[PDB]
Amino acid sequence: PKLVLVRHGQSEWNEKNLFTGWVDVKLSAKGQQEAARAGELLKEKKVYPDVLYTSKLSRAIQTANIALEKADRLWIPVNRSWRLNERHYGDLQGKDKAETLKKFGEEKFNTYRRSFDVPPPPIDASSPFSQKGDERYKYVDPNVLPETESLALVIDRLLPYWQDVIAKDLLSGKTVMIAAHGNSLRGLVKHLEGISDADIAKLNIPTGIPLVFELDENLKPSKPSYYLDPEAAA
Amino acid sequence: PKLVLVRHGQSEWNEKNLFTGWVDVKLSAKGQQEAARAGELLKEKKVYPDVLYTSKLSRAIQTANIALEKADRLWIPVNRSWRLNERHYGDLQGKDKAETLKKFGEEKFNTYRRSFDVPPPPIDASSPFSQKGDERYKYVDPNVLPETESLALVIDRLLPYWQDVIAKDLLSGKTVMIAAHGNSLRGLVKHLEGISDADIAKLNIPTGIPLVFELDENLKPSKPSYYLDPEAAAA
Amino acid sequence: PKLVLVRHGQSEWNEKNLFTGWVDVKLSAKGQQEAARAGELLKEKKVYPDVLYTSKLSRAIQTANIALEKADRLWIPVNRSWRLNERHYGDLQGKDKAETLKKFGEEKFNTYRRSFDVPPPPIDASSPFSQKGDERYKYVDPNVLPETESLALVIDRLLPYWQDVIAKDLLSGKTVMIAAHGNSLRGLVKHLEGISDADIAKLNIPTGIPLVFELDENLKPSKPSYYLDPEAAAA
Amino acid sequence: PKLVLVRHGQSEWNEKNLFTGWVDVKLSAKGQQEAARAGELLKEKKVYPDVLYTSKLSRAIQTANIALEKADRLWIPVNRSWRLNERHYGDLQGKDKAETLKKFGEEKFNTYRRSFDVPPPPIDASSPFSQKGDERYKYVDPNVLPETESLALVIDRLLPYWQDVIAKDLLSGKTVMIAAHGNSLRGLVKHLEGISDADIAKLNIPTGIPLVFELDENLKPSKPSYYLDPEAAAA
DSSP, rough: OOEEEEEOOHHHHHTTTOOOTTTTOOHHHHHHHHHHHHHHHHTTTEEEEEEEEEOOHHHHHHHHHHHHHHHHTSSSSSSEOOGSSSSOOOTTTTOOOHHHHHHHHHHHHHHHHSSSSSSOOOOTTSSOOOOEEEEEEEEEEEEHOOOHHHHHEEEEHHHHIIIIIHHHHHHHHHHHEEEHHHHHHHHHHHHHHHHOGGGGGOOOOOSSSSSEEEEOTTTTTSSSSESSSSSHHH | OEEEEOOOOOOHHHHBBOOTOOOOOOOOHHHHHHHHHHHHHHHHHTTEEEEEEOOOHHHHHHHHHHHHHHHHHHHHSSEGGGGGSOOOOOGTTTOOOHHHHHHHHHHHHHHHOOOOSSSOOOOOOTTOOOTTOOOGGGSSSGGOOOOOHHHHHHHHHHHHIIIIIIIIHHTTTTTEEEEEEEEHHHHHHHHTTTOOGGGGTOOOOOTOOEEEEEEEETTBBSSOOSSHHHHHHHO | OOEEEEEEEOHHHHTBBBBBBSSSBBBHHHHHHHHHHHHHHHHHHTTTSEEEOOOOOOOOHHHHHHHHHTTTTTTTOOOOOGGGGGOOOOTTOOOOOHHHHHHOHHHHHHHHOOOOOOOOOOOOOOTTTHHHHHHHHTTTTTOOOOOSSOHHHHHHHHHHHHIIHHHHHHHHHHEEEEEEOOOHHHHHHHHHHHTTTGGEEEEEEEOOEEEEHHHHHHHBBBSOOEEEEEHHOOO | OEEEEEEEOOHHHHHTTTTTTTTTBBBHHHHHHHHHHHHHHHHHHTTOSEEEEOOOOHHHHOOOOHHHHHHTTSSEEEEOOOGSOOOOOGGTTSBBHHEEEEEEHHHHHHHHHHHHSOOEEEEEEETOOOOTOOGGGTTTTTTOSSSSSHHHHHHHHHHHHHIIIIHHHTTTTTEEEEEEEEEHHHHHHHHHHHHOOTTTOOOOOOOTTTEEEOOOOSSSSSOEESSSHHHHHHH
C-alpha cells in the first residue's frame, strides 16, 4: 500500500505568532503557494492518490483542494475527520507565543509545546478561542471532544480512524493521501516508525512537501519514508 | 428542505471557443473569480450548505472549493457523481464552435446546442477527446457511460442520483449545495419546475450565482426559486 | 466479477392466492426452508459472497439472513434498496387472483400478469395495500415511488442502482449476492443476457436456488449462468 | 435520543461450558428462542429501532435478524464492527470453564473472568481458536486486532466507534439498536452510567431482554435505563 502525507503551510496566525490548535485559521498566501508546490511535486513524481483524508480544519482542506488541482486529481473521493485535527492547544489557543514564553519560562514553554504527554492548560468552555459547540463537530459524542491535548493524546484519538477507516483503503490497494497537521502527522509517523516517546519531540515534518510511505500488508514501512523533494526536506 | 445550485464560470476552453462536454477542462482565471463571488454571496445571504455534491468534472469541483472557502464552510461532507456531469458533447468535444457553425449551418448547429433531444454524433472511443476508459469512471457499469448526449438524456441519467442520494439529504433536513454544469443544472431545474420539453431551451442559468430552491416535503418548490444576486442574474 | 442471485421462496399470500407486489408479506414456513437450502448450496458449491444486496421487503431479507446463517457468512456487509423491490402490483395488491381473472377476463388478466409494458391499474394512496408514506421509503424522492408497475418499469428503476452501486462492488472484485424477487431478478437477467421484450415473459427463476453469473470487465456474461442445483432448477 | 441494547442468548459453547470470546460460535436453539422473545418485546413495547449495529459475530448477528423479524423491521440499515465484539478470551478460548476453575483456583480464575484490567494469557496464532488472519477482519489494521483482552481494553477499542459512528445516528435523532455481547455491552453501560472500575464486575446484563436508555443531547441517561421485561431481567 502507499500513503502520502502533506502538512499544510503557514496559516495567518503562524505569521502573527499565535498558537493555533483547533481554531479554524485560514491558510496564508504563502501557505497557498506551498499547497500548490506540494501538488506539483505529486504530479512530477507520479504519486497518484486514489482517495483523500483531511482534518476538519480549513487550512488542511484548502491545502488538499489546491494541491489536488495542480496534480489533476480533484475528482477523488474525500473523507474528513476531527481525529486528523491538529493538537488542541487548550488555553494557549489565540495566545502570543513570545508572551507565553515570557509568562511560563523556557522549561514550561518547551513542555507545553513538545513534551510527549503533558498537555497545555485546559481552555475555558466559554473562551473566544474555544471550539466547544462548533457546528462541524455536532454529530460527535460531545464528551470525547478535547479541551487540550498533548501529542500522546492526539495519537490516542487518531489511531482508531487510522485503524478502521484509513486502513480499509490501504488494504484495498488504494493510494491514500492525508492532508493534516504538524502534530497529527508527527503522531502518525511516531506510530508507523516506532519512534520513542523521548525521541519524537525532535521530529519536524516540512510543510508543503509530500511524505511518501510504502507499506507492507501489516501497514508497516517496507522501506524508509521519502519526501518528494528530499533536498528541500533536509 | 433547501437546495442551492451553483453553475461554474468559464473554463479555459470556453474562452478559446472549444466545445467541452466531458473533457476535464480547467476553470479560467475569471471562472475562479466568479467561484469566489459565488462563495461571498453564500456567506452574505446567509445560505449555509450542510453537504456538497459535485460532478466528476474539475471545473465544477474547483468552483465548489473556492466558493466554500470564501463562505468558510470548507469542512462539509462532499460527494461526487458522473450523473451530475455536463452533457457529453459527442464528436463535437474539443471542436472549435465557430468552425462547427460553418460546417453545419445556423440550423443543425443551433439544434445540437439547444434542442431538448437531438444528440451530437457519438465520439469514437479512440479520440483524444473521448472519456472512454477514464480512471474516474472505472467503478461505473461501462455500458451506461455516454458517448454522446442530449439534454433529455442528461435528465434520464441524472434523476436516479437525485431521487435516492440527494433526496435523502434534503429529506433529512440538510441544506444541499450542488456545484454542477449548464445542462445538468437546467435538467434539474426543468424537473423541479415542471418546464416542458419545448420551454426548457429558453432557460438560461447564469454562472457564478447561487440559485436557491426552498422545497416542500415532496421536493417541489415551496415558493419561487431565487438567485442570491437577482439583479446580476437578470441582466 | 461473480454475481449470485437468490429468489425468495413463497410468502404467506401465495398460498392464500393474493397478489403481493410491494406489500410486505412474511416468508412462509416453506419459504424459510428453501432459504436454508439456498444457503446450504452456497457452502456446498463454494460460492462465498463478499457483500449482500437486498430489497426493502421482509421475505427477501429473511431469505438472505437464513441463507447466510447456513453459509456461515452472516458477517458480510449488507445494503438494501427499494430498487431491488418486487414489481409493484397496483390496485391488484392484496386482491384475490381468482376474482381478478373473473373481473378482467383471461386476456386482460394475462396482460397485467405477464406483458412487458402494460402495468396493472394504479393503486390509490388510501388503500390499506398502498405503500405510499411507508417509513422504509421516507428518504426517497416521493415523486419516483410507483403506484403500479410493469416489468419494463421495474427494469427502468433497477438499472441505475445496478450501474452505480452494485457495479462498484463487482468492478472492485467483490462477489455480490442479491436477494430479491421474481420480477426484479428477471428484469436483471433480461438485461444481462439481452433477452427480447418478447421472450422474458417465458423466463422463470426457481425459488430457493442460487443462480450464479460469472461476468467479464463489462459485466456481461463470460459463460452461461448456472444454478447451484441444476436439476432442481430445470425440473 | 433512544438506545436499545440486546444481549444475545446462549451459544452452543455456552451450553457445553466452553469459553467463547471471538470464536464465531453459533447461537443455541434456546438462544434463538430468546432472540425471538427479544423481538416480541420490542414490538409489544413500541420500541422501533431505525438502525442496527452489531459485532462481526454470528451469535449476535443472528439475534438481531430473528429479533427484527419479530419486530417487523427487517428493512433497517445495518452496520457491523469488530469494536462491538465480545471480549477476546485469549488462551481461555475453547477451554472448559470448570476445568479452568481447577487449573487456576477460585481466585486466579476469577481474575481472568471478572477483573477490570488484567487480561487472560494471549492465544497462539496457530491455535485452532485464534481469530488471527480471519477474513472478516482483513480490512482492519492487523496491528490493533487483539490476541487477548480485558474489559478495560474492550472499552478502549469500543469507545471510538461509539463516539463517531453510533453517536452520529443518535445525534441525528435516530433510535439505535445494538445487538452485541456481555463484555462489550457492560463496557458501554459502564461508560453511559459512569460506573467505577471497581463496581463494574458487579453488573450483569441478562440475555434476550432489550435494555433501553433514553439519552440527552450529551448522550448521558436522561432517566434510569430500563429493560422491556423488568421482572424477568431482575429475576
